[PDB]
């Protein structure tokens, strides 16, 4: 859940891949979730697949933003009911 | 109009009239931004005595229109003074006036925060004895008042001062204490790098 | 059908006692302890507030001792929220008595009114009984000083010395040995302080968590002086009792 | 027809503790982590607005409200319950004091009067206890500044500094060293901002923090000039622009 | 036709430097017949003094009701009731009923426990508020008291001088009412104590 | 936990009220009853089942009338619909008393739906077990609404409830498709008789009896009355002709 | 009792005297007849002096509660309707004669409410027993597109005519002006045409002039 | 009619024609001997296409108009668009039971796309009637000679306004209780238009 | 015991189970709707699903005009929606009568949320089964969209989604709102916002609409109305020819 840990691991995964220069992972990690050390790699895999679908061979920020919406939506629990808090 | 004219005077390096343009100076935000730009111009010409008169009189000027935005402008003005070199005495004098003002208004947080800055300025001046005394006082204050984010910095400065005094054992002890306080908080990357 | 969700609060058990008041008498034991000593010269009411911390306000804070009339004061042991309504009703009844007779209400009348209020809920209405027990202290020209106690059941008896709340048995056993029939106010006060020291769950006795209410009669006759001991005077008796 | 639930829904457990009360306490201890601390010249009550969906408007939702121009309210439980509570409390405060005495009741009596409603809710049959915990801050010309915390059981305690919510344990255990006998309003607001910094889990800015202050009688917000008797409402609430100025003062 | 003036009554209130003077007559007469000279029309409510003039039954009922209200207020706030609150409470209390309102001329006199400045106010049968910094008087003979008080009252009088001023403003006008007399009582409010004094009147 | 169907206001885990569903299932065990929305008005129809011949013919009726222009035909728990139409008549009477205008059909629908749902909010009231095909003619035209025990009503162009509910709706669809431009009341009554006969084939074991009624402007000028005389026999033997 | 109100372009202004009369005799010389419903809306009562303050207190409490409930500023229209309903439900048994003036984001407004519930609206309006003299003057002098100083001068002239030509009106002049752009300000003793002169002789008496039947002291504090 | 309470009186009149109905009134409110407001309005908009005028006690008329507004808005919100007879119905039902307390005369007139314009009048007793034209108020007691002879059916807008001014001139001049400006409302298929006259012109003929 | 889940009582996790199950009842109709906020007006568009051909399309709609200025779109079972519509209309009536001025959208939303909260707190009552979206233009505040819930948690929205695919439409609109940084659509004409909403809805659901699949409600300055089928067809034709 620490911002520094997610930043470190996101950078580690991004370094091997082909992130575009105009793509910010800090914009992806603005919100503090319970993101695991594995989902935050499958999200980048999904972003890469999304970029490949649009024939782009280098992933952009617009695909990283969409990847967050498809691999991490909710844990359900009670956040689906706002009136509890 | 006035702000654009002052920026133009800056672009022509004739900000010597933008000085009076700002002196003449939602309007609360305009006033605070004009104060910040005038301080930046003062740094640009680097007239140390000019900034020394500028900062405290601006803080007193601050307690007439905006009131709330005093800590922010004071901190950014002091940090802007760091750019201007050959200002050890001037920066120390400005910090002394600011600490007197903080005592006057009983803003304990600003006084504690400003004291560690004055200790750093003393350390840069290489006045090790008075810096050590002030830093011991700050250590006493921050020990009971548990403020690990500031305790890390004061202990690091103490280790620097002790290293400059060649008392290596006490410097190592201070560094180890800072390490103890460091690895329990959200200490920023600057202080962990230091 | 609105039946399966009913708990049948006013129901007789197979052996023959109520069950809700039975558990109210357990809820009483989990609240802060209170002590009441009947002395010849006056009445001392003391209680130890529960859940105490450095951030608890003590300057103007009374949660166990409440004033119902200039002569009559009560001690609360239990749920303060439920005690508030009873306190308000008691004050209303006392002021109505002053309306009707223009004379100070005797303690027994108010004690009966509150006991009846509790019994009415323990009898009908299907509502949970009040989980609070009171300690009544007051003065009059009828019987002099009076020291009753209340229960969620709504029964009251007179007592020369009572302690309702946590560790009731220990406090009663401690006080019964040292209780005589001739103490002044100070002897009763020091006895109560020693009892509280020996019954508390903490280690020391700091002035923050102790409350004192005393009834004194001096030069003026016919009117007693009701003083709720503030912390500044509370810390004074600690050194007199030797606990400090 | 009417209401067939005339029986009390709160029944004493055999262990000697109220069910619904100890259940509402659990419902309170989870949720928004709010706090409020009392200083010498004023009282600051702060809470964070958890924006549920980023398409919503936290401006429309009022996490803090005005019971009286002197007394404000902050909660940490369920939204609608707090809203109904605040409306009812305003109504009964008006009825009890503005109609009969002619002015605004002090904090001490208003807190007891509002807690009357909740301690009746746990008693009157067919209804459930309120799932909120109220932080009441107020000032009066005799008892001065005072802050009160109201628990769903109906019990209210005077506290110099407090916090209720998910981060209640950390904030409560962190406020002792922060707090001392003498304090200033800006000192108090800086203390509150520092305490709330770690307890927030979302974006940190002026929009996500709801902050109100009870201070001196400011006449600008009074809405009229000419009466020396009154000098304005003591309860003021910072906007996003106001709070994002001391936010970087850390 | 007018039950308020059947039993008779007068009242006078003065203001001064940290001092307030309130005086009343001790006579209670029924229509043409006098009954008792022990009836006092001023009652002690904390540090606030309230006097009632008019129907005697209304006087005692209002006395008890106000004592009840201030007793509840004192038990709630753990201290006395400021006269500024007291006057508004009295004004609101009379407005509970409209068709059968009490026929009283009450006046509330007291000193604030914090500011210390003198406070005094009056009302009417219905309960219309009336606050003046000079003097408020009431009763069946109020016309007699008003002119005499205007002639005699000077602002900022010495506290001992208020007693003589109110005595002259009351006695020489008390004899001008058939239902007033049988002596009088004068109350002087001071921050330390209250001076209770009687006055001598011809019996007629 | 179990017992989610014991009470009324309780919500099931999937969010569906259960007593209302059981009321719906009780509705289907009732006599079939159809209604056709012809161009000018509406045409109701019922299939009151003839029990042992002791029952008197042509006397027991099920098409209740509200005011003059609203008709009610009900299936399922017949008494429950009796009470529902009684309350509806009271509402129409109140409206005509304090507005002096005959109640429009959608307003009557709103009133009846609000009454029906008032009985599926509490724990101390059983939901209605009657489905109605109430309709009629008003100033703006003609309307035919089916009400369901859940409280949901819709502006149908034709509806039917009962044992032969499913069979009746198929012939309703066939009639609607055959005449997209519209349908006259005179042919609508014969079509309604035919539809009822087709639906009754499921209950051929027991004897049948047909009663029909229609509200229209062309002939009845906004008045509701049954079908008597040669018209009913003509509809009957026309519908029996194709059989 | 004379109360007037004048509506000008930017806002509205009302005025009142300070003499409270219970009949042939005057009770108090300096009183505040202007009642505050909200910081932006003001009311002044006439007719009976005993229903005005109670009714205005009721309406002020309820209106401020409603504004807090709606989390928005109060509106003069809502207050006017609420006065209308309250006065009507008593069926003409309350003789309260009130003026209502206020501004809102919709604009500025000024109405009058009668004892039995009647309502009216006008740029100039004077209500009460002494309203006649002032209302004649304002009908004589009023015109379109008034200014703030012109409006207050017209109100002062109207109240001066009322106090000079009527017995029950006099002493000081109390004026409240409502400004759309700025805050509404309240003037206390704006005009004081009547000032009591010093007495020829001082009626101070020597000490002990009146005999005392008995001396006693009553306790106050514990 | 109580003693001292504010009453309207004056005259109110509405005339139907081809394109709709034109309803008229004055601006004078005479309270006993005095005239309180001379620029007031006697016209109440209970609905956009349904209009009502007030006569009798001012407070009673205003209260009944507010109640009718509430009921009519309820009707248009839930059931459907209103009509003239419904507007008269709510007025009659409001006035009937409380006739001991409430005593006022009301005239309602509205335009619709089906039955064109209709005028319904409520006398003091509370009955309802449909008439091509109707008058109410104390000032209306004098024009009975003029309007009845000069009334025509299916007139036009210009002739209708000409008749309305030529009828209200005598009402204003012959009775002092009626005066001030003359207010006109036009209800047609195009919409509702507000027309106001001035004292200095209709008097000059 | 186990009677916790049946009535609105707290749970070992501190939850109100009945209110939680009430939300699952709002998706029974699986009708997806969204409302955007224009520069000066508001438009709300909802899917119009007609199950059977016997339905009259005109009468079946989940959009109710509360008053001449306030419109409302409700998702969930219709009978409870109609109950809520009746109460909302009656309360708008009462407020307009008592205060004399048309009420803003937020006040109505807060009052309905308070009513729902009273429903939840009282045990003998059951919570409303609907989710109401109040939409209007406030001259005092501006265009506004307000969405309540069965619990009573109401809050203004820049743009509201609902239905089974509420999350997907929410992200689809959020990408646009976070890229354009504006709190409302910059289109001045109510014509353009309708096509904007329809285009985004089509791209979100992945479906193509006809004259009858969707019903659009438009709230301009001091005016609310529901567009007819021809209007929706013209809008769809304009969208098709434009893109």
From Swiss-Prot, chain B:
Miscellaneous note of the record: Present with 16800 molecules/cell in log phase SD medium.
Role of this protein: Component of the lid subcomplex of the 26S proteasome, a multiprotein complex involved in the ATP-dependent degradation of ubiquitinated proteins. In the complex, RPN6 is required for proteasome assembly.
GO biological process assignments: proteasome assembly; proteasome-mediated ubiquitin-dependent protein catabolic process; ubiquitin-dependent protein catabolic process
Species of provenance: Saccharomyces cerevisiae (strain ATCC 204508 / S288c) (Baker's yeast)
First-to-last residue of the parent protein present: 6 to 217 of 434
UniProt GO molecular function: structural molecule activity
Oligomer and partners: Component of the lid subcomplex of the 19S proteasome regulatory particle complex (also named PA700 complex). The 26S proteasome consists of a 20S proteasome core and two 19S regulatory subunits.
Maturation and modification: N-acetylated by NAT1.
Cellular component per GO, a single term: proteasome storage granule
The protein, known as: 26S proteasome regulatory subunit RPN6
Domain of life the protein comes from: Eukaryota
Alphabetized UniProt keyword annotations: Acetylation, Proteasome
Family note: Belongs to the proteasome subunit S9 family.
From Swiss-Prot, chain E:
Keyword Cytoplasm: yes
Disulfide cross-links: none
Sample GO molecular function, one term: endopeptidase activator activity
Pfam families per UniProt: Proteasome (PF00227)
PROSITE patterns found in the cross-reference section: PROTEASOME_BETA_1, PROTEASOME_BETA_2
Phosphoserine modifications at: 30
Crosslinked positions (Glycyl lysine isopeptide (Lys-Gly) (interchain with G-Cter in ubiquitin)): 69
Similarity comment: Belongs to the peptidase T1B family.
Biological role stated in the UniProt entry: Non-catalytic component of the proteasome which degrades poly-ubiquitinated proteins in the cytoplasm and in the nucleus. It is essential for the regulated turnover of proteins and for the removal of misfolded proteins. The proteasome is a multicatalytic proteinase complex that is characterized by its ability to cleave peptides with Arg, Phe, Tyr, Leu, and Glu adjacent to the leaving group at neutral or slightly basic pH. It has an ATP-dependent proteolytic activity. This subunit may participate in the trypsin-like activity of the enzyme complex.
Name of the protein: Proteasome subunit beta type-3
Originating organism: Saccharomyces cerevisiae (strain ATCC 204508 / S288c)
Gene name tied to this protein: PUP3
From Swiss-Prot, chain F:
Keyword annotations from UniProtKB, A to Z: Acetylation, Cytoplasm, Nucleus, Proteasome
Assembly and oligomerization: The 26S proteasome consists of a 20S proteasome core and two 19S regulatory subunits. The 20S proteasome core is composed of 28 subunits that are arranged in four stacked rings, resulting in a barrel-shaped structure. The two end rings are each formed by seven alpha subunits, and the two central rings are each formed by seven beta subunits. The catalytic chamber with the active sites is on the inside of the barrel.
Domain of life per record: Eukaryota
Residues of the full protein shown: 5 to 247 of 288
Biological role: The proteasome degrades poly-ubiquitinated proteins in the cytoplasm and in the nucleus. It is essential for the regulated turnover of proteins and for the removal of misfolded proteins. The proteasome is a multicatalytic proteinase complex that is characterized by its ability to cleave peptides with Arg, Phe, Tyr, Leu, and Glu adjacent to the leaving group at neutral or slightly basic pH. It has an ATP-dependent proteolytic activity.
Organism: Saccharomyces cerevisiae (strain ATCC 204508 / S288c)
Residue intervals passing through the bilayer: none
Origin organism lineage: Eukaryota, Fungi, Dikarya, Ascomycota, Saccharomycotina
Protein family: Belongs to the peptidase T1A family.
Gene: PRE10
Name of this chain's protein: Probable proteasome subunit alpha type-7
UniProtKB/Swiss-Prot annotation, chain H:
Presence of the UniProt keyword 4Fe-4S in the record: no
Matches recorded under CDD domains: proteasome_beta_type_6
Catalysed reaction equations from the record: Cleavage of peptide bonds with very broad specificity
Paired cysteines (S-S): none
GO MF term set: endopeptidase activity; threonine-type endopeptidase activity
InterPro entries reported for this sequence: Ntn_hydrolases_N, Pept_T1A_subB, Proteasome_bsu_CS, Proteasome_sua/b, Proteasome_suB-type
GO biological process: proteasomal ubiquitin-independent protein catabolic process; proteasome-mediated ubiquitin-dependent protein catabolic process
Subcellular location: Cytoplasm; Nucleus
One of the record's GO cellular component terms: proteasome core complex, beta-subunit complex
Alphabetical UniProt keywords: Acetylation, Cytoplasm, Hydrolase, Nucleus, Protease, Proteasome, Threonine protease, Zymogen
Record flagged with keyword Acetylation: yes
Active-site residue list: 10 (nucleophile)
Protein family (similarity comment): Belongs to the peptidase T1B family.
Oligomeric and partner information: The 26S proteasome consists of a 20S proteasome core and two 19S regulatory subunits. The 20S proteasome core is composed of 28 subunits that are arranged in four stacked rings, resulting in a barrel-shaped structure. The two end rings are each formed by seven alpha subunits, and the two central rings are each formed by seven beta subunits. The catalytic chamber with the active sites is on the inside of the barrel.
Additional observations: The side chain of Thr-10 acts as a nucleophile, and the N-terminal amino group acts as a proton acceptor.
The protein, known as: Proteasome subunit beta type-1
Organism of origin: Saccharomyces cerevisiae (strain ATCC 204508 / S288c)
Gene: PRE3
